[PDB]
Point group: C2
Chain length 304, copies 2
Amino acid sequence: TPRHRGIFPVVPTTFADTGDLDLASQKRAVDFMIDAGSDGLCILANFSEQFAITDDERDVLTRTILEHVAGRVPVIVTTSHYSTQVCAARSLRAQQLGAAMVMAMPPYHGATFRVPEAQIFEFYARVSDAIAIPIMVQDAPASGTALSAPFLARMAREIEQVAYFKIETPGAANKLRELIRLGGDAIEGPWDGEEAITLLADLHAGATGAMTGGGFPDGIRPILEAWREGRHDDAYARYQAWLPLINHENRQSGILTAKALMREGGVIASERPRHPMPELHPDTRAELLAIARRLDPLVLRWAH
Amino acid sequence: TPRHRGIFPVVPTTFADTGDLDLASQKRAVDFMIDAGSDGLCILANFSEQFAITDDERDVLTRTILEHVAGRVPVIVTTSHYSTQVCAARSLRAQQLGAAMVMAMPPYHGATFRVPEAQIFEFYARVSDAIAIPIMVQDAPASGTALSAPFLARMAREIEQVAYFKIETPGAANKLRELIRLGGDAIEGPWDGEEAITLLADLHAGATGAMTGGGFPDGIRPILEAWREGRHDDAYARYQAWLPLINHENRQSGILTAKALMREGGVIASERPRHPMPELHPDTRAELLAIARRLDPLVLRWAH
């Protein structure tokens, strides 16, 4: 029924050791992620360190990644921006370059500038007016904005392109259940995130998709597949095996997790973030690799 | 002693009714603010709705405003950005275009992305290494980041260009007093903000400058002048007369205050913000103007 379902990991932005964009590694990261079995990819999201790049770099990354993917899997382009007109323009450009969907945080800035529901609704309505591809509404704490289940459901029922959701706030499972009940079939994509930390509970609640870290989508996808097949006990077993990795990414290594793993496996040239974001502490990184090695993920055995 | 002191109001960004940059009105706003007696100007700050414009617009605005100011008064260019290298590059560019100082929020993103003190120090140290003009560190709630007085004083003592500060967090007076005590003469510019709501207590604490709204710097400067003259009682009288206006800006009309005033006075063509930022409520605006008329500010009698 839905146009998209499954696992859509966030593509990290690859930098050279000195901070410059490293497009050669960027393409390899993309290729590994597709080889990992990803149903699709999400680019320029927070786990893509989008906050550390310029508009020019954003456009370069968008064109480069979309061209390299070459239509092999659908791509979700994050177009978040406070300005409605700017978000609309970036979303149109994404569509023109082949994007299958765009993701956008509700308009906001820092932890002081918020926008009333009425204007948020207009923000999405206007972005929707400008494009012909679906919009994924992101419900995450970074925005400091409250997007109730009723409001989200209302946008889905009244705004043409609003059809997908990335629920990353506390109690996502309960919210997803509410969103689906209130939105009905208007809720085409009730998805979760946070690197898949609450994946199993979210699937129970009706989630049909997950936006995770891009270091090991091959380890997470089977969980959604088993759930899809109606094998809940099998889902739990697979969920249990990988939970320590998921947990370490969520609470210890964070954003850099995928890049650290890709660097270890030779997928990318450098795992460094752009200053001032701190490097992974040594033990934190060592523990990450030790857990990953117990799981034999593709990222550590990608002969390309 | 300091290179700069007095009032440095934030220049609002003027848009056309449809959201496009209105450079003609932008120039008139700058001329009015200078005619109002501003000691200097600060551009592209949050009160300039910088979160609603693009990198390209940012550069257009910087060149347009600096050139129009034509060296009449010093200009502080806000160059905030999470990326150290990006901020450094924008700061160097601002300097080359004629900036007298740059203002930067500590690196952060949304309400979720923070940076350890250690990296914040390096962020500022590296921006300083790249330029030859002073840096104004902004201590504001929007960053959701903690910049203790001891840490701020340390940066001033150890980082060459870190010499100015805009303390906008609660209890600014106490912090300013502590910053000055710990920083000594390294604290060249202990300034406040928040449209001057706590100006009098801050001057008592040792503030030598104020970054206010750009709507009525002519009404605020006399307070700082009276204080410098050692006439505390006169400062109080002037403070008392304008406090209702300052207070209405701080809690009722906010960012759009300056633009609503300039528009009413014919200084600019449109007072509208960029969508999705909400327009001022009718009552809030009417009350704003009614208070302004009781004070006869220049913005309502600028014959140009």
